[PDB]
């Protein structure tokens with residue numbers, strides 16, 4: 001067992017399947033309904049668990065039915081929620097998602113303001129009990145405090161540096177590994193060219209920097225020279241959650257081997273297999289399926 | 297004591313408050329959120345209870361946290377759930393509602409397929425114990441059996457004729473009072489003109505017909521002529537205005553038997569409800585409603 005903590009947001013997606021997307025006022029009927037947990041840190045935690053890690057999700061929920069459902073779903077996936085704070089008399093973050101017969105989505109996201117941004121309460125947790133700490137950028141003070149305490153305990157830190165209104169440069173500063181999205185790296189640096197942006201991002205951290213580029217694969221800087229892992233060509237059904245899954249897998253691989261090229265290959269492999277199945281959690285392969293796939 | 301039975305659906309409403317209603321595909325952010333029990337018959341029951349009636353809700357729930365919440369909320373509002381059927385290992389029904397800044401609403405209902413349409417079990421209930429029976433059209437077999445038994449006991453029947461996939465013609469047939477929504481009357485009779493549609497609806501029943509039109513108020517047929525009650529200009533959330541109106545209307549019709557007074561009263565209850573978030577939080581009492589209608 002590798003020991004992973006995933007710090008960030010957990011969001012209930014409630015998915016309503018309709019004939020046409022609701023354009024104007026009036027009552028509509030959903031032929032079908034499913035509910036599934038999202039959140040970068042949450043879905044990464046689900047991935048790491050699937051790969052045989054002991055995983056803690058550390059985020060915020062309310063004391064509503066949604067909060068209880070989110071924690072329940074995560075427990076069922078093999079993710080511990082013991083260090084997740086439940087706010088008294090508080091609504092959790094949730095989306096209502098309408099899906100057309102095309103697959104076109106309307107997403108109404110409620111990021112709950114009842115979930116307070118202050119992360120001082122993480123000072124009550126001993127981060128020495130994990131081999132790696134992964135953080136999403138959607139709970140800024142969480143990532144900051146979680147990474148500061150992880151640094152102080154000599155624990156590896158891994159950022160999912162997605163795009164966000166707020167500036168993540170202080171998070172990157174505290175990241176032994178900063179795996180950005182294209183939008184994430186562009187928003188951070190203000191540079192459009194990914195090669196130049198990665199170089200500018202490297203100046204922010206004594207750790208390594210990476211950028212994921214979907215089917216174009218993943219690039220990182222080692223010795224100051226740009227390395228490339230191609231995506232695995234696969235029969236793609238759904239890329240939903242590929243980034244979250246990649247970051248979860250990357251954190252496990254980095255904590256296990258410490259080899260960047262092997263770790264980036266491993267994560268590219270886990271994410272690829274996830275893309276060949278419907279759903280953003282349903283398609284996440286286990287370690288045996290992932291070893292089988294990487295053997296071929 | 298006025299004795300009311302409300303037959304229909306009980307639904308958990310998740311209400312997302314947005315800047316504009318979604319025009320096309322993409323990601324939108326809700327400024328605010330509330331979670332509250334809805335269902336036409338359910339919210340009507342809550343309104344009638346507020347107005348001092350002894351109320352029974354008669355519908356179907358699951359044995360999930362949602363079902364337990366829905367029943368709990370109804371008990372807390374003064375509504376008896378003794379005749380409501382609980383399905384074992386069953387999910388309850390739930391609606392996502394979008395509300396823009398004007399108060400325009402989009403409702404996506406998921407009716408749980410675990411809740412079986414069979415209403416034969418209502419034959420085990422004695423409908424003689426109520427003065428009026430209100431039914432929504434969202435549980436067809438329920439409304440049909442409930443109205444059949446109400447007719448047989450000489451009990452007044454009041455339909456909330458909202459829009460629904462099924463044809464409500466046989467429900468209207470059994471309705472002493474058929475209060476439609478604009479979409480409800482249009483789906484039933486085809487006519488887009490409310491005036492002509494009401495005339496076509498009247499042919500289906502020896503009882504009276506009504507149509508609610510939101511801020512445009514309420515119209516009904518009396519003495520072969522369209523009467524009009526304007527809405528009372530007041531708006532945070534119009535969610536459940538129709539349900540609240542129908543509950544209020546049923547109490548008022550049972551108290552006075554005066555259509556014009558009953559429609560004015562219900563218009564007043566529903567208007568006050570539009571000034572608070574959710575389908576239930578703003579439901580006024582008789583005193584609050586008399587006070588408001590005096591001003």
Ligand SMILES: Nc1ncnc2c1ncn2[C@@H]1O[C@H](COP(=O)(O)OP(=O)(O)NP(=O)(O)O)[C@@H](O)[C@H]1O
Pocket residue numbers: 181182212213214215217218230231232233234236239240241242243244246267268269271272275
């Ligand atoms: N179509 C694809 N084919 C193969 N591998 C893919 C594909 N899409 C994504 N991947 C893999 O998953 C990784 C992350 O996907 P990518 O789209 O870069 O992340 P993102 O920008 O974070 N998207 P998202 O998960 O929706 O937030 C890539 O580096 C690939 O290794």
Ligand SMILES: Nc1ncnc2c1ncn2[C@@H]1O[C@H](COP(=O)(O)OP(=O)(O)NP(=O)(O)O)[C@@H](O)[C@H]1O
Pocket residue numbers: 399401458477478508509510511513514526527528529530531534535536537538539540541562563564566567570
């Ligand atoms: N915006 C409003 N301002 C004032 N009164 C209103 C407003 N909306 C509704 N009402 C009153 O409420 C009554 C019924 O509401 P209406 O919107 O016609 O029902 P509906 O469309 O069936 N609503 P719903 O409960 O969500 O299905 C009307 O007859 C009015 O008297």
Ligand SMILES: [Mg+2]
Pocket residue numbers: 162181243244
């Ligand atoms: Mg991403």
